[PDB]
Amino acid sequence: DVTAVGLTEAGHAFVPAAVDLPDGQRVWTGRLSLPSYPWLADHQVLGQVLLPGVVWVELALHAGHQAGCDSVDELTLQSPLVLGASDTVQVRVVVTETEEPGTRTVSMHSRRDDGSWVTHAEGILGAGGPPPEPLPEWPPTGAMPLDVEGFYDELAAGGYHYGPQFRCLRRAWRAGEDLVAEISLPEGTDVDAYGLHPGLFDAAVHSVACPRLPFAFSDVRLFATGVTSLRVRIDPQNSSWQAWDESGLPVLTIGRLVLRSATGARRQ
Amino acid sequence: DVTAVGLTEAGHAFVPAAVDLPDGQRVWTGRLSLPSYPWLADHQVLGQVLLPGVVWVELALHAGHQAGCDSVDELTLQSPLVLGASDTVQVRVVVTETEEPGTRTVSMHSRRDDGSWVTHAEGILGAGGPPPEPLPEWPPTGAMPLDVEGFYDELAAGGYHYGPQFRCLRRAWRAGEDLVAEISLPEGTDVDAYGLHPGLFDAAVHSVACPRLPFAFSDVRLFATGVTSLRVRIDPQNSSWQAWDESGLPVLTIGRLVLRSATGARRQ
């Protein structure tokens, strides 16, 4: 119970404590390791366990909401975080007020014991945004069912080995020039301490493949927490995402997402 | 156990946790209240429970030692901290690296729930200092015993009501132009989680009265922890302190100390 040491319970699985500072700064803190979250081993690229980049967006959405900034105006990923089998890593989310109210900087960092701080993401938290649009029918129509059989075996062949907690893609269609998909977590996935569980958040992004890593995010908003199943619409003409729950209520919008390509401890 | 939230156990009663930050900053954090440390009610000035100013020096000595800076080059007190009967207060000690190694800034802050941050002290942590001198005989000789009967009743009459944990002065002599004193904690005082227990630290300073508050500290060094009884020598020609334990081993030096005179919640 962190209030006994003058901190605030922060209500997130990855950053359970928050440290208000006289800076106008607020810092969310946690410890990441595979024994604490074994399902993190289900995100392995080229034999390395990497923290999914969408984890840093999820943390920004959580910190920004707690700070009054319901929008991730901008988040840019930098160095990846590789989790060894033995590794334990301190994590920080640092939110800093600016000279313009309603706009705050955010940065994400980690540190291993015998090591220095590493910056994993930097960005800007903002107020509000465009309202989401409704889901008038599902699936969209004139939409052709796509064969997603062995979709994950295909990704594995290109080096992206998605484990049980990340194999969330269930059905997909081509809808005009857009991609639409049903994506859902395995049954019994605990999502209480997340805004959007990383495995479902990641499958929302990696479904664009019907094998790359997210790089830069613009205008991300989360409208609902605790969602375990999504209906997703992806538009590559400005690489944007909309997600609704099974009843069509809005869950997530990404105004723009740009991807990128491929150090680290040794495997096994 | 704060390591589970990515922090460090800091080993001090008032600041049990430390937050390393990528700033090069390190922050010690705690919660202060009279139910957690009821002996803090034993330091009451003009009816107000004030945190003794020497608490901020003790915290600086603890943080500086953990950061490699064995000297409080400089600490200047600002706003006092008044503890209400009901009050709970978050405290921070913020240590920041500078452009000159071996020298770091330190600042002390508090915040009540419905309130803003308040700065209680600012200063500079440094490396090393002058070595302490030995204690060749005790008491010093040609030293005349001073009557310290009702010393605390006298202080009370001027508004300084020292309670059991702070009534540590036992014997005093005039030694030439210097003051020397034996000062010790009540039996059974737990000092495990302090460098120098605040009640004994404060009695070292307030013994100068054979009724004022500390203001500015220069060149403070703590040579030993866990001491419960002190032999003290005060020199008003540069308002300096030396303290040894009962066996003459060095405990504390204050290179220079300047005092000062007299908001707050309502008593009772």
Author numbering:
A (entry chain A), B (entry chain A): 31 to 239, 301 to 359
Paper lines:
The dehydratase (DH) domain within type 1 modular PKSs is responsible for the dehydration of specific C-3 hydroxyacyl-acyl carrier protein (ACP) intermediates, resulting in a corresponding enoyl-ACP. Here, we present the crystal structures of the borrelidin DH domain from module 3 (BorA DH M3) and the fluvirucin B1 DH domain from module 1 (FluA DH M1) at 1.80 Å and 2.01 Å, respectively. The DH monomers from both BorA DH M3 and FluA DH M1 possess the traditional double-hotdog fold with an invariant His/Asp catalytic dyad. Within each DH monomer, the substrate-binding cavity contains (1) a hydrophobic tunnel/phosphopantetheine (PPant)-binding region, (2) a catalytic region and (3) an acyl intermediate-binding region.
The borrelidin PKS from Streptomyces parvulus Tü4055 utilizes a rare trans-cyclopentane-1,2-dicarboxylate starter unit. The first DH domain, isolated from the third module in the borrelidin PKS, is specific towards a trans-cyclopentane-carboxylate-containing polyketide substrate. In the case of BorA DH M3, we were unable to model 11 residues between α3 and β11, suggesting a highly flexible region within the DH domain. A lack of modeled residues between α3 and β11 is also observed in the erythromycin M4, phthiocerol dimycocerosate, curacin F and the rifamycin M10 DH domains. Surprisingly, the same flexible loop region between α3 and β11, where residues are either missing (BorA DH M3) or have higher B-factors (FluA DH M1), form part of the acyl-binding region. From the catalytic Asp located in α3 to a conserved Pro in β11, the residues between them form part of the bottom of the substrate-binding cavity responsible for binding to the acyl-ACP intermediates past the C-3 hydroxyacyl position. The lack of 11 unmodeled residues in the BorA DH M3 acyl intermediate-binding region would yield inconclusive in silico docking results. Therefore, we opted not to conduct substrate docking analysis with the BorA DH M3 model. However, no electron density for the corresponding substrates was observed. The lack of substrate binding may be due to high specificity of both BorA DH M3 and FluA DH M1 for their native PPant-tethered polyketide intermediates 1, 4.
